[PDB]
Amino acid sequence: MILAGLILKLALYAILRLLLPLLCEAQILYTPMIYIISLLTIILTSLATLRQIDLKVIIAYSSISHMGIAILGVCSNTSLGIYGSIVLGVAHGFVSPALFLIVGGILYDRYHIRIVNYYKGLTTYMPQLATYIIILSFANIGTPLTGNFTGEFLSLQGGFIRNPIIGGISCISVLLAAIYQLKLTNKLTGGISSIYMHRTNDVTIREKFIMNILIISTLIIGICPQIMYNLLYWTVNNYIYII
């Protein structure tokens, strides 16, 4: 939770605070190489996710993808790119910890294994866990009214502005995120209860507290992202090198 939520956001803060206000001309010269690298990060990691077996590893690969979108935006020399790449980092640090809680402190606590092949049919005996899985899955992929869409859209606005081709070929993340997340959500919530797994309790109130916080926060910034502008209206323009 600490890693995905914060330590990967440090890399973004490092760009904005060390690499852009200085080294401006190197950014505007070497940006296309960044777009190459971020684009390969997006698609290859998403496709690598389609053929994994461990639950926690899949959420991890998604974190690589959303950071790579956020790099397209912050490294785009535009205001909307900065305000999107930041909002991606925030909403990602709300959504991903919830998923790592679901797959690492719920299921692994109950049954002590992370292989998808065992898991199937939670909806029958663990319905509330099903509801949370689908909500967080549709927030991860970037369903609107969630910060993980508003940040996707804005970063892809700015990435399209800088290089339209790369910023449009990177729109397939809107699809590939849905593929590697829904192929899994369908398995878990779907089917008849696994013979390998006995029954255990539904989610307890402690975990329900956590997931409901991490969902209220992202729904808020998904509904009115403008609240975060009062801190960032300078930062969207300090780091823009345009004559």
């Binding site: 205001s79 909307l80 305000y83 049919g121 909806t123 029958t124 689908i134 549709f138 369903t143 609107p144 009214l145 508003t150 804005l154 829904l182 369908n186 919530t189 779907g190 089917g191 008849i192 509904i223 009115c224 992202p225 403008q226 502008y229 969207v236």
Partner: protein
């Protein structure tokens, strides 16, 4: 204290959300009738609105709060019932009301009626948000969430593998 457009937009939202919060307390019987009746009230609002628009044809708007005013980009949650919108509403609202009444007799014997009726009204509310919205963004919201709701409805029999 009357608003065709406000009532068109909130009543379906009531019928989608209240069952999800209160279904164990209310039972599938009352839920079927409440969602049916509220979506009936909505259809009457649209037929009468259709009459008025034929009389005058100045569309009503509904300019709500700001989603994003950053830099050369103002996106509000605006809503409007224009001519094209009121026709799409006639199809949506009429068909959804009929289906909410037909899916009482078809879905008796089914244990999970509450979630079924909540989803039908969910789809109705989100298409209403689609046809109404006065900007492409409010359209994209309805675009995505009806596809979400379609996943849940087609998956309504979660045990049936092919449905998933």
């Amino acid at each position: 204290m009357y608003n065709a457009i406000s009532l068109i937009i909130i009543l379906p939202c009531i019928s989608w959300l209240f069952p999800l919060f209160f279904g164990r307390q209310l039972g599938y019987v009352f839920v079927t009738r409440m969602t049916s009746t509220l979506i009936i009230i909505t259809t009457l609002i649209t037929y009468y609105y259709f009459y008025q628009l034929l009389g005058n044809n100045n569309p009503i708007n509904l300019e709500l709060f700001n989603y994003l005013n950053i830099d050369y980009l103002d996106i509000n949650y605006n809503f409007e019932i224009d001519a094209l919108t009121i026709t799409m509403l006639l199809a949506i609202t009429t068909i959804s009301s009929m289906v909410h009444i037909y899916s009482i007799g078809y879905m008796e014997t089914d244990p999970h009626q509450v979630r079924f009726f909540s989803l039908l009204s969910m789809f109705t509310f989100w298409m209403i948000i689609l046809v109404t919205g006065s900007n492409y963004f409010v359209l994209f919201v309805g675009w995505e969430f009806i596809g979400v709701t379609s996943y849940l409805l087609i998956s309504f029999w979660v045990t049936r593998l092919q449905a998933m």
